[PDB]
Amino acid sequence: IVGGYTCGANTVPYQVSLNSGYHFCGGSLINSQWVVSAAHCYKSGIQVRLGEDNINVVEGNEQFISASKSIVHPSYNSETYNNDIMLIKLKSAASLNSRVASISLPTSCASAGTQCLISGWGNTKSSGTSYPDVLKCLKAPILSDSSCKSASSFIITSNMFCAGYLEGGKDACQGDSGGPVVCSGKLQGIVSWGSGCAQKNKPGFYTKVCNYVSWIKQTIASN
């Protein structure tokens, strides 16, 4: 997260860190046994870390739980990032409390202009690199579909929205991948892609979760 602020410990209780020896992606807890992340975060050897603030210090509210199953969206396209969404089942159910909580799935899609909360342990710099150990947060508006298309020379589908600041300076970044975009208490986005971070006219692109509620619910019900 570039140009954001320190969330505060466990203020984003649905935020998870995906760990394979080191933090490599964010994710969102949607019930006691299931995390939603980005398909581009796919790998084996994933341990899910809940209750985290400082990812380098055991602070006392963590739960570490191995993944038993990962399901990449049937139509994920790694060239375009279309359908960049993946579900992870936990080997055991997380113990839910004020610091480890699920986030509601949306009933309707969000609109352009809504300020949403984006969070993660990703790079905090637009040029060069610096990784925080505590969770970073950012409020960013959803941009109009037309504005997003005008600002990119890459494929944009109806399964994406863009959000952020066309003047640059504030955005998600590498390491925030798979993490939440929350708008009025609903999980509306997943950190997917963008050209650099926090660059002029290069806003962040996000998987549009409202298009996938059906798939998410059916998949969880049958697995």
Ligand X SMILES: N=C(N)NCCC[C@@H](NS(=O)(=O)Cc1ccccc1)C(=O)NCC(=O)NCc1ccc(C(=N)N)cc1
Is 177 an annotated catalytic residue? Answer: yes
153 binds, among Cl ion, Ca ion, ligand X, none (CB under 5 to 8 A by kind): Cl ion
> Catalytic annotation on 84?
yes
145 is catalytic: no
What does DSSP assign to residue 145? H
- Binding to Cl ion in span 121-160, by CB under 5 A: 152-153
The candidate with the shortest Cα–Cα distance to 156, out of 200, 203, 197, is 203
Contact between 199 and Cl ion by CB under 5 A: the answer reads no
Q: Considering just the CA atoms, what is the radius of gyration of the chain in Å?
A: 16
Residue closer to Cl ion, measured from CB, 57 or 155: 155
211: three-class secondary structure by DSSP: helix
CA distances from residue 83 to 69, 98, 133, 147, 183 in whole angstroms, order as listed = 19, 31, 29, 21, 20
Binding site residues, Ca ion, CB under 5 A: 52, 54, 59
171 binds ligand X (CB under 6 A): yes
Site string for ligand X, 122-161 (x = CB under 6 A): --------------------------------xx------
Q: How many CB atoms sit inside 10 A of residue 105's CB?
A: 18
Instruction: Quote the least distance from Cβ 156 to ligand X, whole Å.
Output: 8
Q: Which does 93 bind (CB under 5 to 8 A by kind): Cl ion, Ca ion, ligand X, none?
A: none
Among 46, 191, 210, 216, binds ligand X (CB under 6 A): 191
SS3 content of the chain, % helix, strand, coil (to 5): 10, 35, 55
| DSSP code per residue over 158-188 | TTEEEES-TTSS-B--TT-TT-EEEETTEEE
Determine the Cα–Cα distance for residues 20 and 162; give it in Å rounded to an integer. Answer: 29
Q: Catalytic one among 40, 126, 176, 192? A: 40
Residue 173 beta carbon to Cl ion: minimum distance, rounded to whole angstroms: 16
The residues annotated as belonging to the active site are 40, 84, 177
Binding site for ligand X (CB under 6 A): 40, 80-81, 154-155, 171-174, 176-177, 191, 193-197, 204
